[PDB]
Design an enzyme around this catalytic site. Structure first.
Site, PDB file in Angstrom:
ATOM      1  CG  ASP A 158      -0.375   0.309   2.576  1.00 32.67           C
ATOM      2  OD1 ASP A 158       0.785   0.756   2.697  1.00 32.67           O
ATOM      3  OD2 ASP A 158      -1.125   0.182   3.578  1.00 32.67           O
ATOM      4  CG  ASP A 215       1.102   3.714   4.525  1.00 30.04           C
ATOM      5  OD1 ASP A 215      -0.036   3.363   4.894  1.00 30.04           O
ATOM      6  OD2 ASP A 215       2.023   2.887   4.311  1.00 30.04           O
ATOM      7  CG  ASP A 274      -3.860   3.071   4.458  1.00 33.72           C
ATOM      8  OD1 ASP A 274      -5.037   2.803   4.116  1.00 33.72           O
ATOM      9  OD2 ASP A 274      -3.059   2.205   4.832  1.00 33.72           O
TER      10      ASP A 274
HETATM   11 MG   LIG Z   1       0.030  -3.151   6.948  1.00 34.94          MG
HETATM   12 MG   LIG Z   2       2.242   0.868   4.163  1.00 32.86          MG
HETATM   13 MG   LIG Z   3      -1.030   1.553   5.053  1.00 37.44          MG
END
Ligand SMILES: [Mg+2]
Ligand SMILES: [Mg+2]
Ligand SMILES: [Mg+2]
Ligand SMILES: [Mg+2]
Ligand code: NA
Length: 326
Positions: A193, A195, A250
Site C-alpha cells: 500500500d 501511506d 491510506d
Molecule cells: Mg500493513
Molecule cells: Mg504501508
Molecule cells: Mg497503510
DNA sequence: CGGCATACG
DNA sequence: CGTAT
DNA sequence: GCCG
C-alpha cells in the site's frame, strides 16, 4: 545489543535475512493462533538479527543477545546445521497456516474472521465468493480487488499517486501538504500500500479536510472503494500502460501541532512503534501515541517541532526512517 | 509472576 | 469487528 | 516466548 528495537539502528536490508524470515514465519503463525505474546517475542528475535553487523554463523553468537531463549535459539541452530528448521517447514506447509494467511491478506478480513471461516470449512477465495451474504461491503471490495492488491506497489506507482493526491488536496485546502509515510519513507522499493500524511501550516485549518479530499478524488474517478473523519483506507485506480490497477492507499490528516507525532507513528515500522511506545511508558514513564507524548505526573503534553525533538525527549539517539526497519 | 502499543472507522 | 504504523 |  540493547533490548528495545528503538535503541538500535535497523536497516532495510541486512546480513541475516534467512534466519529472520524463519522467525517471522513463527511470529505470524503465533498470531493466527491468538498468541500475541509469542508473536512479539519471535518478531523481536527476528529484529535483533536484522540489527546485527554481520551474518550469524555459529550458535555461540546468540549468547547474550536479547530475546533469544531456548525456542528461538533452537530454530537458528537447526537452520545453521541443516539449512532448514523442521518446525518452520511444518508450519509453512500446514493447511491452517496457508488458509489463514490467504484469508487475512484480504482487505477487511482479520484473524478472527479468517479463523471463523476456517472452522466453518472454507479454504479458498472462490469459497468466499460463492457466499456473498457472509461478506461486508469492505470484504467484498477486498475480495474483488484481491489479485491487484496482491501485486507489489512500485516506487514509480508512488510518485504518480502522490501527484494526484496533492492535486485533490490543493483544491480542498490551498496550502495543505502531503507527506509520504510508511514503508516507502523507510526506503522500501516495493509495498502493498501507499501511506500519506496531510497537514496545513495554520493550526486548525485541517479540520474537515479529509471529506473534501475524498469527494474530489471520487469525482475524478480515481476511487474504487472508500469507507464513505481523519483516516481513510482507500482503493485507488492507478493508470497502467493501456489499462490500470487497483492500489491500496491510506490517508491521514493531523494538525500541524501533532505532525511530528503523526509522522513518527505513520513511518513505522509497526514493531518499531510498538517498541518505542513500550520504551516510553516502561523506561521513561511517558505515554506516547500518534498525537503526542504525555507526562502523567505533571499532566502535560510535550510540544515537539520535529521527530528529532521526540527522540531527544525520550533520551534516545535519533534514527532516520531508513534505520527504523525493525 | 505480569506484561506485551495505540489509536481511529 | 475492521484498519493503520 | 521471553524479560525484568
Ligand atoms: Mg500493513
Ligand atoms: Mg504501508
Ligand atoms: Mg497503510
Ligand atoms: Mg506466564
Ligand atoms: Na486483512
Amino acid at each position: 545489543m540493547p533490548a528495545y528495537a528503538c535503541q538500535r539502528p535497523t536497516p532495510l536490508t541486512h546480513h541475516n535475512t534467512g534466519l529472520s524470515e524463519a522467525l517471522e514465519i513463527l511470529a505470524e503463525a503465533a498470531g493466527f493462533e491468538g498468541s500475541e505474546g509469542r508473536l512479539l517475542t519471535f518478531c523481536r528475535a527476528a529484529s535483533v538479527l536484522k540489527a546485527l553487523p554481520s551474518p550469524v554463523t555459529t550458535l555461540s553468537q546468540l549468547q547474550g543477545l536479547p530475546h533469544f531463549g531456548e525456542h528461538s535459539s533452537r530454530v537458528v541452530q537447526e537452520l545453521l546445521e541443516h539449512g532448514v528448521c523442521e518446525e518452520v517447514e511444518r508450519v509453512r506447509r500446514s493447511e491452517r497456516y496457508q488458509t489463514m494467511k490467504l484469508f487475512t491478506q484480504i482487505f477487511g478480513v482479520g484473524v478472527k474472521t479468517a479463523d471463523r471461516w476456517y472452522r466453518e470449512g472454507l479454504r479458498t477465495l472462490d469459497d468466499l465468493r460463492e457466499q456473498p451474504q457472509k461478506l461486508t461491503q469492505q470484504q467484498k471490495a477486498g475480495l474483488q480487488h484481491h489479485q491487484d492488491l496482491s501485486t507489489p506497489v512500485l516506487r514509480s506507482d508512488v510518485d504518480a499517486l502522490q501527484q494526484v493526491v496533492e492535486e485533490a488536496v490543493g483544491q480542498a485546502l490551498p496550502g495543505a501538504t502531503v507527506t509520504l509515510t510508511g514503508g516507502f519513507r523507510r526506503g522500501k522499493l516495493q509495498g502493498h500500500d501507499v501511506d500519506f500524511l496531510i497537514t496545513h501550516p495554520k493550526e486548525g485549518q485541517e479540520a474537515g479536510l479529509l471529506p473534501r479530499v475524498m469527494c474530489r478524488l471520487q469525482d475524478q474517478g480515481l476511487i474504487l472503494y472508500h469507507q464513505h473523519f481523519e483516516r481513510s483506507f482507500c482503493i485507488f485506480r492507478l493508470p497502467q500502460p493501456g489499462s490500470w490497477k487497483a492500489v491500496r492507499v491510506d490517508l491521514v490528516v493531523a494538525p500541524v501541532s501533532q505532525f511530528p507525532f503523526a509522522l513518527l507513528g505513520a513511518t513505522g515500522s509497526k514493531l518499531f512503534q510498538r517498541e518505542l511506545r513500550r520504551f516510553s511508558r516502561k523506561e521513561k514513564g511517558l505515554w506516547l501515541n500518534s498525537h503526542g507524548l504525555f507526562d502523567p505526573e505533571q499532566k502535560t503534553f510535550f510540544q515537539a517541532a520535529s521527530e528529532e525533538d521526540i527522540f531527544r525527549h525520550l533520551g534516545l539517539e535519533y534514527l532516520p526512517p531508513e534505520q527504523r526497519n525493525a
